[PDB]
Paper text:
We obtained two crystal forms of [name] (residues 34–168, lacking the signal peptide from residues 1–26 and periplasmic residues 27–33), crystal forms I and II, belonging to space groups [name] and P41, respectively. The crystal structure of [name] monomer consists of a five-stranded β-sheet (β1-2-5-3-4) flanked by five α-helices (α1–5) on one side. Each crystal form contains three different dimeric types of [name], two of which are present in both, suggesting that the rest of the dimeric types may result from crystal packing. The dimerization occurs mainly via hydrophobic interactions formed by A37 and I40 on the α1 helices, L50 on the β1 strands, and W55 on the β2 strands of both molecules, making a hydrophobic interacting core. The “back to back” dimer presents a Y shape. The dimeric interaction is mainly hydrophilic, occurring among the main-chain and side-chain atoms of N68, L69, D70 and R71 on the α2-α3 loops and R116 and S120 on the α4 helices of both molecules, resulting in a complex hydrogen bond network. The apo [name] structure constructed beginning at residue 34 has a compact conformation of approximately 45 Å in length.
The [name] system contains three protein members and modulates intracellular c-di-GMP levels in response to signals received in the periplasm. YfiN is repressed by specific interaction between its periplasmic PAS domain and the periplasmic protein YfiR. Previous studies suggested that in response to cell stress, [name] in the outer membrane sequesters the periplasmic protein YfiR, releasing its inhibition of YfiN on the inner membrane and thus inducing the diguanylate cyclase activity of YfiN to allow c-di-GMP production.
Author numbering:
A (entry chain B), B (entry chain A): 34 to 168
Write the structure that this text describes.
Amino acid sequence: GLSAEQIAVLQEQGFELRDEGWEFGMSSKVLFGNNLDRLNPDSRNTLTKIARALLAVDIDKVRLEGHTDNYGDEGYNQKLSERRAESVAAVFREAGMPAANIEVRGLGMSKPVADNKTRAGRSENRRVAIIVPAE
Amino acid sequence: GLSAEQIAVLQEQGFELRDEGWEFGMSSKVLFGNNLDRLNPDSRNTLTKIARALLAVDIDKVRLEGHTDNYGDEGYNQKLSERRAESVAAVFREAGMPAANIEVRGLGMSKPVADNKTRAGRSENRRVAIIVPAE
């Protein structure tokens, strides 16, 4: 049961509603640049800001999901996606979100959002979803 | 898109976000009893309240979609399902939603949410759905 005031904050922070709840997806290019799992300093501050905004209205559970394109080793992409999700998780922990309320998954190339047949598609598949689970 | 106060009312009213938008399904047995497209008075009562709740927060455009199971003449089931969706549009007009803002479709047997092999599945397929369009 999310209040209208909580929904307002999620909307202002850029979340959109999906099957699993309120989701804010950011591409890996925005989040990490040419880094591996170290966030761009700017992206990290941005994420700390989102985290504090949710917590201010007692939104204090998040699920963090990492994705890669299909290009490359499945196993490597899998670990990378997970480490990338964990980088975002750590920002939410330091921002004051309980470790038990934070869930981190690496989904590798399993859950595309765009077509791996094009270089532009693949780029969109490399991403981390911030989800606030709600039914 | 919809506001936080609107989303909250939809959720309260039992609507769920689906791929075509916010959807609230009602079984044809509850709506029509043994009638054809005549609503039974209790269901009329129930529908007026939903309309008013939506109307109270400027949700004044809906799509109403009637469905049947796969039993019987397909041509007849289309017509029955459209007529049933129309009975619901009339309640919504009378509650004050502009006629031009109501979209009626009879989908007959073509959009099942369950399996028609069993009586249980067939009864769930027999429904009218209220849709508030969305992103």
